[PDB]
A paper describes a structure:
Here, we probe the mechanism of oligomerization of a peptide representing the CCD of the [name] protein, a tetrameric multi-domain protein that is over-expressed in several cancers and associated with metastatic spread. [name] tetramerization is mediated both by an intrinsically disordered domain (STIL400–700) and a structured CCD ([name] CCD718–749). The CCD of [name] is necessary for its self-association.
Our previous studies of the isolated [name] CCD domain ([name] CCD peptide) have shown that a single Leu-to-Glu substitution at position 736, a d site of the predicted CC repeat in the [name] CCD peptide, leads to a decrease in its thermal stability. Presumably, this is due to the disruption of the hydrophobic CC interactions upon mutation from the hydrophobic Leu to the charged Glu. Indeed, expression of the full-length [name] mutant in [name]−/− mouse embryonic fibroblasts completely disrupts the formation of centrosomes and cilia compared to WT [name], which rescues this phenotype. AUC-SV measurements at 10 µM and 500 µM of the CCD718–749-[name] peptide returned an oligomeric state of 1 × monomer mass. No detectable change in the Tm at different [name] concentrations was observed. These data are all consistent with the [name] mutation destabilizing the proposed oligomerization of the CCD peptide leading to a folded monomer in solution without the additional stability measured for the WT CCD. The [name] peptide formed an antiparallel dimer in the crystal state. The structure has hydrophobic side chains in the tight dimer interface, which the program SOCKET2 identifies as an antiparallel coiled coil with typical knobs-into-holes interactions. However, there are fewer exposed hydrophobic residues that might be expected for the peptide to form a tetramer interface previously predicted by us and presented by others. Helical-wheel projections for one heptad repeat of the [name] mutant indicate the potential disruption that would be caused by placing Glu-736 between the helices of the putative tetramer.
Author numbering:
A (entry chain A), B (entry chain B): 1 to 32
Amino acid sequence: LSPDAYRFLTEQDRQLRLEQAQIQRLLEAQSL
Amino acid sequence: LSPDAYRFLTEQDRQLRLEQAQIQRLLEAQSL
Ligand SMILES: [Cl-]
């Protein structure tokens, strides 16, 4: 990977984790 | 959220986790 691609993938990793956390918060709020 | 939205977002969570793992594998393969 180029340095640019490496940087992009590290940023994508953090963003995927943030999206997971947001989804988890929404799902956990759905009281039955 | 509707039950359908709960199901959909749970599936999106699974996909995000898989994509994150694939990106991590690519990052861990890098070399100086
Ligand atoms: Cl949370």
